[PDB]
């Protein structure tokens, strides 16, 4: 039912100063914290009201930890360059994502810690939280170091313990807005494409969480055969939006049905022109 | 709440 994720991104910009570092923290599909090396404070900033209530000791440590993440990323750029014999001049990216999921029962299910270089998988913690998938041969050298220093153990601890403890604290503290489900405000649009073809856009507006499935059917038969399907987009509202379109022979609209299934709807919905 | 577990690759 719930997760906490932290996403980190680190961009070497050689000749233009230290690398760019952006860090963002999510509970489900709500951002609560941020850090931007290029902003002014140089501190972990709040990004949802329910986190502003945390004490100086919190903000101190979060700042300390993220700075510690930047430095690690900053060195990582060096070593990864080295590992691949690349040059001082080119800009590379490092990404780190890590978090913990919980069930409707708010207990542990699953921990994860994934690490990319230039947008490819590079190293991941397994689901056993005890070993590593090392993609390349250079990742292999990373894995030996991470074994020799027991990073997996230490992560398993954080992932099964403090992570989930805090996620709970967060869910508690932000009930008014994190516990909500907002069902979609679905409707339908009709556009004359040809002399003989219409589009049917099936709209799902202003829902939370983000997770949603829109399908089309021609007389009950699950019609991907002409289905355009955009990415779940944010509204800014703290909601989400999505659509799905099918071109139909003009005059046979009435054989087509959109099927919207969100957490926030009792039973799957069905619209027809 | 962020980990302390970050290690030079």
């Amino acid at each position, epitope marked *: 039912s719930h997760s906490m994720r932290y996403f980190f991104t680190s961009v070497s910009r050689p000749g233009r100063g230290e690398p760019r570092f952006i860090a963002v923290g999510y509970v489900d599909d709500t951002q609560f914290v941020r850090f931007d090396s290029d902003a002014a404070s140089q501190r972990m900033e709040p990004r949802a009201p329910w986190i502003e209530q945390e004490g100086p000791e919190y903000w101190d440590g979060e700042t*300390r930890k993220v700075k*510690a993440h930047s*430095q*690690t990323h900053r060195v990582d750029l060096g070593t990864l360059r080295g590992y691949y014999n690349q040059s001082e001049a080119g800009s590379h990216t490092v990404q780190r994502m890590y978090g913990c999921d919980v069930g409707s029962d708010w207990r542990f299910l699953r921990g994860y810690h994934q690490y990319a270089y230039d947008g490819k998988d590079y190293i991941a913690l397994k689901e056993d939280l005890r070993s590593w998938t090392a993609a390349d041969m250079a990742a292999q050298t990373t894995k030996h170091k991470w074994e020799a220093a027991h990073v997996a153990e230490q992560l398993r601890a954080y992932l099964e313990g403090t992570c989930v403890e805090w996620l709970r604290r967060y869910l508690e503290n932000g009930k008014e807005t994190l516990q909500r489900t907002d069902a979609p405000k679905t409707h339908m649009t009709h556009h004359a494409v040809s002399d003989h073809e219409a589009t049917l856009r099936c709209w799902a507006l202003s829902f939370y969480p983000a997770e949603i499935t829109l399908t089309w059917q021609r007389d009950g038969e699950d019609q991907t055969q002409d289905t355009e399907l955009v990415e779940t987009r944010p509204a800014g509202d703290g909601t989400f939006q999505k659509w799905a379109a099918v071109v139909v022979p003009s005059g046979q609209e009435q054989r087509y049905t959109c099927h919207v299934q969100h957490e926030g709807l009792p039973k799957p919905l069905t619209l027809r022109w | 709440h962020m980990t*302390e*577990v970050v290690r030079h690759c």
Partner: T-cell receptor
Framework: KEVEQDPGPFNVPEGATVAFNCTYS??????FFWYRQDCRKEPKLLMS???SGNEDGRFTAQLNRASQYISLLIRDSKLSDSATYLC???????????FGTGTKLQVIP | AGVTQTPKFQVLKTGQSMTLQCAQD?????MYWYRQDPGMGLRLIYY???????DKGEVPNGYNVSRLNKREFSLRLESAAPSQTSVYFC??????????????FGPGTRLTVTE
């Protein structure tokens, strides 16, 4: 001090097992080590210490976060083990490391 | 190799001044200067988390440092006092921001100041 250990010295017969312990104030403390230092020489890492007791040869180190101690066990102790053992903590990232005042071990033939 | 530290021994007249050198070829970010005295442990003097910055430790009174570069790190005695007789150790680590950051020590410098 963030760490305490007993100065000894502890006299153990050559071959016998010895056990060392260090306690620490701060439950948040993330990382731990034992260091070994010969008379008039420089500290050198012996090993790091995790909750999963790492038995490496004659040496075994234990961390107990619950109770806030770490231990070091030496089996089949040798004349060459006589030294001062230091417990060392790194609270967490970007925090100062503290070095224990050390336990002297003397191995007796 | 690892951490080198020079000189190994030194005498000094109360009021005299002098600077200890330390360098490391392990490509380490963080470097440190400590002194050792019976009864207490190592006491951190100053440290240099990274090539740019330095910062006082627990007992900086009497001392300064220069992070000359990613490699070397020097600790100066302005005017030696009799309370500065002790053993000094340089050390370095990949980076104090990481978990499990082992320190690597130099062989030390034994320092007597006399009347």
């Amino acid at each position: 001090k963030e760490v305490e250990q007993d100065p000894g010295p502890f006299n153990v017969p050559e071959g016998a097992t010895v056990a060392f312990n260090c306690t620490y104030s701060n439950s948040a403390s993330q990382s731990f080590f034992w260091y070994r230092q010969d008379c008039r020489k420089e500290p050198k890492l012996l090993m790091s210490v995790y909750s999963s007791g790492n038995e490496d040869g004659r040496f075994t180190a234990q961390l107990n976060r619950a109770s806030q101690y770490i231990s070091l066990l030496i089996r089949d102790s040798k004349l060459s083990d006589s030294a001062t053992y230091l417990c060392v903590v790194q609270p967490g990232g970007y925090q100062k490391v503290t070095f224990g005042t050390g336990t002297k071990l003397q191995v007796i033939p | 190799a690892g951490v080198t530290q020079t000189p190994k021994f030194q005498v000094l007249k109360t009021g005299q001044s002098m600077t200890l050198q330390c360098a490391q070829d392990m490509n380490h970010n963080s470097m440190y200067w400590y002194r050792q005295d019976p009864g207490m442990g190592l006491r951190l003097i100053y440290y240099s988390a990274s090539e740019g910055t330095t910062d006082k430790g627990e007992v900086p009174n009497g001392y300064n440092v220069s992070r000359l570069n990613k490699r070397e790190f020097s600790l100066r005695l302005e005017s030696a006092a009799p309370s500065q007789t002790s053993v000094y150790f340089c050390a370095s680590s990949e980076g104090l921001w990481q978990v499990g950051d082992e320190q690597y020590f130099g062989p030390g410098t034994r320092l007597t100041v006399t009347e």
